[PDB]
Design an enzyme around this catalytic site. Sequence first.
Site, PDB file in Angstrom:
ATOM      1  N   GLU A  72      17.609  34.517 -16.330  1.00  0.00           N
ATOM      2  CA  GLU A  72      18.680  33.849 -17.065  1.00  0.00           C
ATOM      3  C   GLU A  72      18.151  32.580 -17.710  1.00  0.00           C
ATOM      4  O   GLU A  72      17.182  31.995 -17.235  1.00  0.00           O
ATOM      5  CB  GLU A  72      19.850  33.536 -16.130  1.00  0.00           C
ATOM      6  CG  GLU A  72      20.469  34.772 -15.486  1.00  0.00           C
ATOM      7  CD  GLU A  72      21.545  34.434 -14.473  1.00  0.00           C
ATOM      8  OE1 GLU A  72      21.752  33.231 -14.203  1.00  0.00           O
ATOM      9  OE2 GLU A  72      22.181  35.371 -13.947  1.00  0.00           O
ATOM     10  N   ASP A  97      34.064  50.407 -16.461  1.00  0.00           N
ATOM     11  CA  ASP A  97      34.093  49.052 -15.934  1.00  0.00           C
ATOM     12  C   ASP A  97      33.758  48.052 -17.038  1.00  0.00           C
ATOM     13  O   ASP A  97      34.380  46.987 -17.133  1.00  0.00           O
ATOM     14  CB  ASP A  97      33.153  48.894 -14.727  1.00  0.00           C
ATOM     15  CG  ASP A  97      33.473  47.657 -13.903  1.00  0.00           C
ATOM     16  OD1 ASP A  97      34.669  47.313 -13.803  1.00  0.00           O
ATOM     17  OD2 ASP A  97      32.541  47.024 -13.364  1.00  0.00           O
TER      18      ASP A  97
END
Length: 155
Positions: A72, A97
Amino acid sequence: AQAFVDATWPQAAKAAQSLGVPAHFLVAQAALETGWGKSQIRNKDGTPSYNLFNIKAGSNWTGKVVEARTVEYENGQRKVRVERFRAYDSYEQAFQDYADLVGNSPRYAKVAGKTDGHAFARALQEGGYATDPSYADKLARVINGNALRQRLMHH
């Protein structure tokens, strides 16, 4: 991979209609996220998570999970940690989802209905889908790229 497009397109189609976007936009995003399936998160046994969108568990996620390494970016800083990701029973469940998340989270309100690849990718990036600063640019290139196009017609 052609096998990647063949395995994902049908399930991409159902979720894509829930979001009002072309199916191949979702196949492209999955391909970008997982390197055309070569880097999809797998269980400890090597069993597929089917989590082609790299969706982390929410705090109250109940059901299957896989701890996985993830990268990240925060500021100009690269981060590497292990986080809990969702795991599913099938690509269908994964796509559903994803449509649930993107379709119902207020920050992604501008995503639904986008039928231009750049506009779709930008709406995701501006909504905070990814920490990679060039996420939208990269996604747009896959969506409009010859690699995906040839594999779609082949499908």
